[PDB]
Write a protein that binds this ligand. Structure first.
Ligand SMILES: NC(=O)c1ccc[n+]([C@@H]2O[C@H](COP(=O)([O-])OP(=O)(O)OC[C@H]3O[C@@H](n4cnc5c(N)ncnc54)[C@H](OP(=O)(O)O)[C@@H]3O)[C@@H](O)[C@H]2O)c1
Ligand SMILES: NC(=O)c1ccc[n+]([C@@H]2O[C@H](COP(=O)([O-])OP(=O)(O)OC[C@H]3O[C@@H](n4cnc5c(N)ncnc54)[C@H](OP(=O)(O)O)[C@@H]3O)[C@@H](O)[C@H]2O)c1
Ligand SMILES: NC(=O)c1ccc[n+]([C@@H]2O[C@H](COP(=O)([O-])OP(=O)(O)OC[C@H]3O[C@@H](n4cnc5c(N)ncnc54)[C@H](OP(=O)(O)O)[C@@H]3O)[C@@H](O)[C@H]2O)c1
Ligand SMILES: NC(=O)c1ccc[n+]([C@@H]2O[C@H](COP(=O)([O-])OP(=O)(O)OC[C@H]3O[C@@H](n4cnc5c(N)ncnc54)[C@H](OP(=O)(O)O)[C@@H]3O)[C@@H](O)[C@H]2O)c1
Lengths: 249, 249, 238, 247
């Protein structure tokens, strides 16, 4: 009876750059109050918020280390824009490791950022969201959870766990809070990818095209706008998870 | 120019219930729409009349989808232009079970749910000019994500449509994308009084049925976000995620 | 084992033959179904019977009416308690060159016939005996690709039916499956499998007996495929 | 040959782990019985094995601490480990809304971190002219997800995910497969009468028998084309389907 965007405060983790920024600015331009979470990118976050507010939107910046104490984060956000109703678990760490050379410190960091904190923030959002309001969690995962391979060993396991948690969180938080996910494919070159590498990779996707940045915010809004959807994921990935031509064929 | 006026739609079984809801959403958004029907000709003509009298572009085409369908796409494209968006909505839903399988009904289930969607998709591909991308949306059933032994041949035929959603997406990439909607309980069934439908809905994880507007919104969501192929959204109130089975109650 | 009569479809050559001869050496009565390989089936049955077993040959075109086949077998070796749906048709087609006659044949041999034979087995199974169906599918149903379009759809449906048959036929009959990889033509392909080795014929009979001997297993599949369904280095990864 | 395939079974002193150890040892495998608390049960099992002419030893280690000497302990006594059964488990309840990360961490340490580390150490110490096998003992619930036992389930689901990616990483020389038990023996919190009612509600209406577990490890060992896969010894539990929205 009150799901208008002005009454749906959003918290986007790692929201000051790249895909997180694209989600923040999409939601803010559609009338959602947005809390831009960041850690290192505070300058960028404040600039985004100032631009939104000067344009007549409603945005704030909140700062927290997602590998430390995140127990005040939802409250820092709700103190500024009201009880968080839509949580986008976007923040990420994407470091390579391999079976045979596993460093468990890096392992722990992947699981902290991609699994522990998203679950904790979902819990905290649920606890603080008034009972007459429904909520939504959107987890940002990775297309590779739908096409497992042995590279990026601990990273992959932590993102796969976030996809597993999307189902079990959805079951646990139903009916009042829905939990869905986005699995990006090659969207913006990683730190290890030259432009040639990103382009060659995109040309090898089944759709031969990268997800465009507007598709991410549109998908969050799609999940918000269709209340029968929970426990589900859209891969914005150019078909990557459906790639199939292996050397044995 | 992917403007909706340049995206003719064919909806099979589009004169009633979910198919009608999809037709009317798309036409209200500026898509030219071909309403396929079989027994519901009067209903389909009334819909198309209302759309055309409103300044839209609609027509009605007839075919028994258990027989020859190889002229159906052309019936539509002769009226509204090359079909660019195919919604395989038509369905037959008749109970059978292991122990008393009648292969005549089995054949009808696979005709409507598998042979026809595949043939129409290929016919759409052959007639759609190479400089236009296309979309197929298959309407399946939440149960393909939570297999059970009821409605035996119906279920196998719908599961096959979900399988074909993936291999069609792989075959028709990059130019044509193939996605799916898996409905849950949307409207009461035969021998289901509204009280009965409500009691079943209350046992869904989200305790709410998909509403008809969600179907058109989902079709348009697939149309507008070009990185999605081979995927399905269950508009089902969480039904495929139900988990309280007798072994754990 | 002599209490467990077996029907193996397409049992006269290659993988079916290897399953037949394994089970026969372990004391299972076996009915060898075949169509074109009648002389080979009779030769296998003769060796089994000469060596003290109990084998027969039954004939049927599995693209047509198969409703007498289980009884043809049970008339000779007793009510069937182990059904191996091994027979297969493997012809190439693709979207955009679809021949529906071939499509119908793939679905007849891989889906309609396995289900009907399972249905007949269930109706004939004595009350005091449990049963097992083993469907022979294909590793590709665990790594979908668009090649061999109607063949793949029909094998995927057999895998779907393995689950729903298992649900429908419990507790009396368990329904499991084997997903073969490249067993017989090749040599270069195998080196590209993750295990760099092909499944060997003894593994198939060992797997059928494994399913028989462990009664808590239903609705499940083993891929004897050298890891083929786990292949992952696709063009976007290289 | 099984005489040339030394086995390490984590948590092998009781219940399912004991069933696996005794099945393998009685079939000619040298068996390193790992335990932590159940040292008396462990030494007893191995002594009965040895007295019977088998070849068993007991290695002790806390799987949540330094496990980097455990494979060495085993292989010092019975030769380089060729078959690792990651069976050790912790099964404690939590749920969304009251999650304590200390328990969460233990679930992931015993079900994911340690199985992966031990597999890593096995591959390091296995002579290159020998192939190997890892069998992860998981849980049928990874094939029928539900929101109960939240951190436990996530950690078991991770072990199932790792079964695929370890299989891809360690191929061709080492295979990685899994067993997903259903209701086998009542838990520290489940009454026998409740365990029986649960079994009566399984699709097959019977629990796995303890011999099925060792038979399954031996099945994986004897059939060299199998990797990255799991058998659920669960009486059909993961296939149960009649929920209140249908029933
Ligand atoms: N980009 C792609 O092509 C692609 C492909 C597949 C998957 N993905 C997924 O898509 C999402 C967005 O991708 P992206 O490339 O935009 O991500 P990103 O730039 O690599 O990182 C997102 C943000 O996470 C924040 N973060 C990380 N660790 C943190 C910590 N300990 N405390 C607080 N904040 C922390 C950082 O914010 P600060 O900089 O403010 O500290 C960082 O800017 C991620 O979940 C990623 O895994 C992306
Ligand atoms: N409604 C639900 O609660 C629900 C739940 C799960 C899945 N679904 C799926 O959602 C879709 C729509 O549901 P619905 O309840 O609206 O379906 P429906 O009324 O049972 O079927 C839709 C239309 O299919 C057409 N059709 C059937 N057989 C045909 C044939 N041989 N030739 C030509 N057209 C044929 C009929 O058109 P005419 O009337 O013109 O003959 C019918 O109006 C279906 O795919 C259904 O399986 C629905
Ligand atoms: N071999 C492989 O490398 C491989 C790989 C993946 C999957 N598979 C699967 O493993 C199984 C065995 O493989 P395979 O290569 O040995 O199979 P196959 O030789 O192609 O076929 C097995 C038997 O099926 C019977 N059959 C086929 N159509 C029939 C019909 N209309 N009526 C009656 N019988 C019919 C034939 O019996 P007759 O000779 O008596 O006419 C044939 O001998 C099959 O299910 C196959 O799909 C095999
Ligand atoms: N039993 C069932 O019905 C059932 C159902 C589903 C899944 N499972 C799975 O089947 C497997 C065996 O089940 P179970 O019931 O026999 O298991 P269990 O008795 O509950 O535990 C196995 C053993 O793991 C060892 N262990 C645990 N944490 C350890 C640590 N930090 N360091 C060293 N050893 C540690 C313990 O050995 P010590 O006592 O020597 O310290 C314990 O006895 C497990 O993986 C379990 O999750 C069982």
């Amino acid at each position: 009876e009150a799901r208008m965007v002005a009454n749906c405060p959003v918290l986007v983790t790692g929201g000051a750059r790249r895909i997180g920024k694209a989600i923040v600015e999409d939601l803010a331009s559609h009338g959602f109050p947005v809390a831009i979470h960041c850690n290192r990118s505070l300058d960028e976050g404040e600039a985004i918020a100032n631009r939104i507010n000067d344009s007549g939107g409603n945005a704030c910046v909140v700062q927290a280390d997602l590998e430390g104490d995140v127990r005040g984060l939802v409250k820092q956000a709700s103190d500024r824009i009201g009880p968080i109703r839509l949580l986008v678990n976007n923040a990420s760490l994407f470091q390579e490791d391999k079976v045979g050379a596993l460093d468990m410190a890096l392992w722990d960091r992947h699981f902290a950022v991609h699994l522990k904190t998203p679950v904790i923030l979902a819990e905290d959002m649920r606890k603080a969201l008034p009972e007459d309001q429904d909520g939504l969690v959107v987890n940002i995962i990775d297309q590779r959870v739908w096409k497992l391979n042995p590279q990026f060993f601990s990273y992959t396991l932590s993102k796969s766990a976030l996809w597993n948690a999307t189902r079990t969180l959805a079951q646990a938080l139903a009916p009042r809070i829905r939990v869905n996910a986005i699995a990006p494919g090659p969207t913006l070159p990683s730190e290890r990818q030259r432009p040639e590498d990103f382009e060659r990779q995109v040309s090898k996707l089944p759709l031969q095209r990268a997800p465009e940045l507007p598709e991410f915010g549109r998908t969050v809004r799609y999940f918000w706008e269709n209340r029968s959807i929970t426990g589900q994921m859209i891969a914005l990935d150019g078909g990557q998870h459906l790639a199939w031509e292996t050397p044995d064929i």
